[PDB]
Write a protein that binds this ligand. Structure first.
Ligand SMILES: Nc1ncnc2c1ncn2[C@@H]1O[C@H](COP(=O)(O)OP(=O)(O)O)[C@@H](O)[C@H]1O
Ligand SMILES: Nc1ncnc2c1ncn2[C@@H]1O[C@H](COP(=O)(O)OP(=O)(O)O)[C@@H](O)[C@H]1O
Ligand SMILES: Nc1ncnc2c1ncn2[C@@H]1O[C@H](COP(=O)(O)OP(=O)(O)O)[C@@H](O)[C@H]1O
Ligand SMILES: Nc1ncnc2c1ncn2[C@@H]1O[C@H](COP(=O)(O)OP(=O)(O)O)[C@@H](O)[C@H]1O
Ligand SMILES: N[C@@H](CCC(=O)O)C(=O)O
Ligand SMILES: N[C@@H](CCC(=O)O)C(=O)O
Ligand SMILES: N[C@@H](CCC(=O)O)C(=O)O
Ligand SMILES: N[C@@H](CCC(=O)O)C(=O)O
Ligand SMILES: [Mg+2]
Ligand SMILES: [Mg+2]
Ligand SMILES: [Mg+2]
Ligand SMILES: [Mg+2]
Ligand SMILES: [Zn+2]
Ligand SMILES: [Zn+2]
Ligand SMILES: [Zn+2]
Ligand SMILES: [Zn+2]
Lengths: 56, 281, 282, 56, 281, 281
């Protein structure tokens, strides 16, 4: 898979080939992360917190 | 036909919808509305149909409204999102048409909420009109519990969370019923079984899916409910009352369906794309 | 006919409506929905018409919905309250039908807001879809101001306040225009003049009322806008663009009218009660 | 007019005969108060603070 | 001697303090910190003593801090306001010195709060470290109530409200004990009796006053707690525990005292002004 | 000697401290306070020293308070976290001691904030007492911007955010100076350079590191400030002022130090572990 850096702990994050931009991945540091596209790169940033209007 | 899939967080449901669009050879783009702004102009009119999938109800509502302004047909429409997204508005529509709903009283202040508890007696359910996944759905069994819940709601940052739906508690089977309709036709139903240490059936809270038999009374209740609110792709939550039978609890405008698939073996994303192809090509 | 006047905070406007009900011999009750709960049943069907007056838009929306479920005709309706109380929903309906609105872009995150500023350039107005009295309507004139406003919106407790309406700044006269329509007919218009140290015209913020000539294009604009949204008793805010003329900025579902009255001398509460008697007598 | 006690500072509040239950009155102590009916009595409670959805 | 009285909303307490200043021939000014800003400079140094009385905790804390920067002695001091304003900080100081407190577990996340409920068992008290008038002090009877409370507090706008103080529920005398100290000397105590339909004693919530006799153990507990926090004009809330005896529940750094005055007929404002005249002239 | 390392989200800084503890043969446990509750009891007294590293200020504050209750020496202490975490409390201690700070006016209401803007004139900086990474630090250029900022902060859910620190805008070197002190001795300093399209120097906002030579005046200002707050492991932010020279802008009680390490090649974690070993064994 692809190896991306955690924007929180700088650890290594193994992101599956399954992953699409916008998917959530959990890292061992305790951070929830979102994958996004930066030009030709997949990258990770801090995921949003659950909003009071979130769900179905 | 060109389809746009509107997303913020991409869950398994969004991935399966994108896969179904691909496999059925539908041209589609994905716009992430947590990342891209949307102009009020005719540019988005290049799309024939938008499938509205943000997890944020306000994002679903507003992205739908912008796309509609460009003449894109949205699933669901902003009118449906607004109604199904709000339990008081949903109850108002359903009650007017004689669809059974839980016996409900609306309280729009702390003072009014305590009066509603006093009128109704215990036990009762108190939930706000906005929310999903069981969030802030509270079981109120005595006045101490009611008083502390009232105080907690008063400190919420969204004033819609301060509106109280105070309802009879309907549960004697250990489950609720979840159905999905596409095109105002019933796709299927299944049971969400309440897990230990819970009062709520939501799959998000540990609710376990199982299949059920769908009798004519259940089908007709659902179909009528969906027809009243005009949802194109919606879920419906049904409670079972020991005297009254099926009671409609809520409808949802951006339905999740992981649990529905494990129970029914229905390929929901495939069924949705087939519907869109047949109706909007 | 039996009317219910639904209130939470009683302002001059509510007092004037109550007085006009009394003076025109209309049987009415007041229910304060900040005090009394409302049941989903047939009990409230004792009222023929409900005049929906809470200051809280959510209280207005929900009291109207509960009364409608009992078969009471509400003014305004919950469908009108939902749409007029939300600027994005209002702009959607207006834009679709060819009513001119400010050139606008919607941004549903901090990331998207910054992109919107970058696409449009400065100066711009950034305001949320919910709010009244000018609250959080922000003039953004450079990237520093833009960045600090984005940060501030991110900490709001109502996620609808996190949606940004980013639009062209339209002001060259030092005022905006406020009209009122009853039964989708124009009642009147006046100018709210912007006070020193303000960029906003609201009377709540010090905007001073004065009269204007109402020309045909203005009347036609207001009437079409109100007909699109189907309001029975609504206000409309209009901006004047140096090239494009009249641009509809918003509509409001629980209109205030103290300023309207000083400028136009129109007895708004009397016109409303007359309209109700005309159309809903039983 | 009626003389009612401020629920904040215990001082005397002069409420007009105009007064309807639900009307707001300011007091010298800095409190915003709301008129309400308690059986045969007009009384004063602390007013609500402005909500994010308040207005027209 | 020149005194400054710092206020935002002038309650009966602040009016009674202003009156006592006037009647004891003390020169004084009032600064309303909801109206006037306070610079960090040497201007405020004209005051010998500040009596800090805003209703808002933040306003009391920050007005105290600005006045202290100018060399004004403040009653209470900013560090006393910080510690007494926060139950966790107060409990920490008290526990370290061996002053009895209710048995308490601190939970700093939703996950940790559920674990703490599991550790303690039901019923229990869960309150946040900030608040007055009984606000969000919850009697949790079972896991359903616990789960809904956790959920509500996660959605609040002040992170201190996400800290859970999970305590044994003390149920013994149907009252709590409210004391006042000035200059670390006990002024006196009275009882607040819990009214019907309550679990809380606060006068604000319908608690009704009555008198108690202060024994040596109560006096020592109160005075020792006050000296641990260095509080100069504070209230102390005490709970009677069937095994532990008197346990300290909290201290308050801007005490209300109309209840105290009704209960004891002690002129708190006069005693406060006399104390200041005695020690700061 | 036994150390406990208190964490919630494990950033590079926490990983480097853990690594330093093991490489230096220090007996240590990690407690994650986002996962585990902490009781007020004597059980935590098994630790000699606690290194307080949660990312949340309230988790840092309260985890420190509970450990201190058990008699554990915490780095930093709850008293230091309370003062360093709050800009107003910090400025108050520094100003009283004659340590230069930016010229500041505190406004504790919307009305007072407008008055303070009128006293200061534009441009000015308005920031709340609480916050990191430059959050809500606003450069107010005129009354229109000021009025909108006041309105926004009035709608926030933490009352501390309603307190305005209205300061002179310092614009001189296009950077700020960031120092670290351990045991009240200066470890070192570097410069954070303000990037294009910013008014703020934070590395988190794109601030770029460079080196400076620390002169005696800088060292004295930093050591004096750290000594006044009694901080044992803290960062210090200094602004260069064209008339005042070095002014202290803030202190941080859970300092991040990745930028410091890159800029100085000083092994901060190692020095910290050496310090603890040298003083608490
Ligand atoms: N009136 C009620 N009686 C019994 N159970 C209820 C009631 N309302 C909600 N629930 C329970 O709580 C769960 C979530 O409530 P629901 O109204 O569906 O809101 P949401 O949109 O959060 O799912 C339901 O699946 C059901 O188990
Ligand atoms: N795009 C705009 N251009 C110029 N002025 C605007 C714009 N949007 C809002 N305003 C000003 O701000 C005031 C309030 O904005 P409005 O959109 O009417 O919101 P509200 O519902 O808060 O009154 C208006 O009366 C007008 O003076
Ligand atoms: N652990 C407890 N056991 C029993 N009663 C409690 C406990 N904690 C609080 N209470 C009750 O709740 C009331 C308010 O709680 P308190 O902790 O004093 O908070 P506040 O600062 O809001 O007054 C107390 O006077 C007491 O009656
Ligand atoms: N009075 C001021 N004058 C000039 N720049 C300032 C001032 N206050 C803050 N800043 C800038 O903003 C940045 C962040 O502000 P700071 O007060 O350190 O808050 P935070 O705690 O969020 O880092 C500082 O690094 C500095 O570059
Ligand atoms: N939001 C629904 C999803 C059910 C499903 O996946 O079918 C729940 O949590 O119950
Ligand atoms: N809400 C409107 C009221 C105008 C009026 O009173 O006519 C404003 O503040 O401008
Ligand atoms: N805040 C305290 C005040 C008690 C008193 O006035 O003495 C309470 O509500 O109980
Ligand atoms: N929070 C600091 C970190 C500096 C550092 O890592 O040294 C900043 O953003 O500038
Ligand atoms: Mg549901
Ligand atoms: Mg307007
Ligand atoms: Mg108390
Ligand atoms: Mg800083
Ligand atoms: Zn990580
Ligand atoms: Zn739902
Ligand atoms: Zn408006
Ligand atoms: Zn008063």
């Amino acid at each position: 898979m692809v190896v991306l850096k955690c924007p929180v702990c700088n650890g290594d994050v193994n992101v599956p080939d399954d992953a699409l931009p916008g998917e959530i991945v959990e890292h061992e540091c305790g951070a929830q992360l979102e994958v996004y596209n930066d030009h030709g790169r997949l990258a990770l940033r801090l995921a949003e917190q659950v909003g009071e209007d979130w769900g179905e | 036909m060109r389809v746009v899939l509107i997303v913020d967080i991409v869950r398994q449901e969004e991935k399966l919808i994108a896969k179904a669009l691909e496999e059925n050879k539908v041209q589609y783009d994905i716009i992430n509305v947590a990342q891209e702004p949307l102009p009020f102009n005719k540019a988005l009119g290049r799309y024939d149909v938008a499938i509205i999938r943000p997890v944020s109800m306000y994002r679903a509502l507003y992205s739908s409204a912008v796309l509609e302004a460009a003449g894109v047909h949205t699933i669901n429409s902003s009118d449906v999102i607004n109604v199904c997204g709000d339990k008081i508005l949903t109850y108002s529509k359903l009650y007017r048409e004689g669809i059974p709903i839980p016996d409900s009283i609306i309280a729009l202040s702390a003072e009014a909420a305590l009066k509603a508890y006093e009128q109704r007696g215990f036990p009762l359910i108190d939930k706000p009109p906005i929310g999903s996944w069981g969030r802030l759905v509270s079981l109120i069994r005595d006045v101490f519990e009611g008083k502390t819940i009232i105080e907690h709601r008063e400190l919420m940052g969204n004033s819609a969370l301060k509106a109280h739906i105070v309802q009879e508690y309907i549960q004697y089977k250990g489950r609720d019923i979840r159905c999905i309709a596409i095109g105002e036709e019933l796709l299927g139903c299944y049971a969400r079984n309440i897990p230990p240490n819970e009062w709520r059936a939501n799959v998000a809270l540990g609710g376990t899916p199982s299949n059920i038999e769908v009798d004519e009374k259940l089908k007709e209740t659902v179909v009528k409910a969906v027809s009243i609110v005009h949802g194109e792709f919606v879920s419906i939550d049904i409670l079972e009352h020991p005297n009254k039978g099926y009671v409609v609890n809520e409808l949802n405008d951006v339905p999740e369906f992981k649990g529905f698939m494990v129970a029914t073996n229905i390929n929901v994303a495939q069924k949705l794309v087939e519907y869109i192809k047949e109706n909007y090509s």
